[PDB]
Design a protein. Structure first.
Length: 235
């Protein structure tokens, strides 16, 4: 059973909710999702599962690390939701199937529980110092570089408190003169025109041990910026 949740409206992913999740947020492209699952064939045979394993299955959504039907279905899930999805071969393992466990031209059924998702780690260190959650994907591939003139609209939060709200036109490489933390200016360079995102900064990529008295930011503060990259001229 299930409703058609395929973009093409071709009945290739069908979804039943078994248990409603909580909150409103759902995974976006780039986010790291943590799931438990089991897969059956139309004859009832279990072919794969994660529950035998001591850990949860995790992957980046939208980057093609899972089958197409999973990318589609999970973007419709809330944290704590358990759903059943029925996947036509077009959106699964196709005509070849998957040599041993999965037969040719198979329609697959998964039980999937969404446990947790956090944002894309933009750091080269992979130290979690700059995390991005996308709110709206931008328009086209161009990303700002050193010397690019950007127009942005920003809101900085320290816990629930708003400390900085500004719309600004500035040059990438000059943001340090405008009370913008390194980590935010860095992240701006990973955004596409039109993009709206939340950027989470650890103290090191923010204002560090010193903090910023003029914004009432204490030492060792994690910060959250809601930001729009509205436009930019490059080099």
């Amino acid at each position: 059973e299930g409703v058609d949740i395929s973009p093409k409206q071709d009945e290739g992913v069908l979804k039943v909710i078994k248990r409603e999740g909580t909150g409103t947020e759902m995974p976006m492209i780039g986010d790291r999702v943590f799931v438990h699952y089991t897969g059956w064939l139309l004859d009832g045979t279990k072919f794969d599962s994660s529950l035998d394993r001591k850990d949860k299955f995790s992957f980046d959504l939208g980057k093609g690390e899972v089958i197409k039907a999973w990318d589609i279905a999970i973007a419709t899930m809330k944290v704590g939701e358990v759903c059943h999805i029925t996947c036509k071969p077009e959106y699964a393992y196709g005509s070849a199937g998957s040599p041993p466990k999965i037969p040719p031209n198979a329609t697959l059924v998964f039980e999937v529980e969404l446990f947790e998702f956090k944002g894309e780690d933009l750091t080269e260190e992979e130290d979690g110092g700059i995390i991005r959650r996308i709110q709206t994907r931008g328009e086209g591939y161009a990303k700002p570089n050193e010397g690019a003139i950007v127009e942005v609209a920003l809101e900085g939060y320290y816990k629930d408190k708003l400390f900085d709200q500004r719309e600004l036109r500035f040059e990438i490489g000059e943001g340090e003169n405008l009370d913008l933390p390194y980590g935010l200016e860095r992240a701006i360079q990973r955004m596409e025109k039109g993009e709206h995102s939340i950027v989470y900064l650890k103290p090191s990529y923010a204002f560090g041990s010193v903090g910023k008295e003029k914004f009432q930011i204490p030492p060792n503060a994690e910060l959250k910026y809601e930001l729009h990259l509205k436009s930019f001229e490059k080099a």
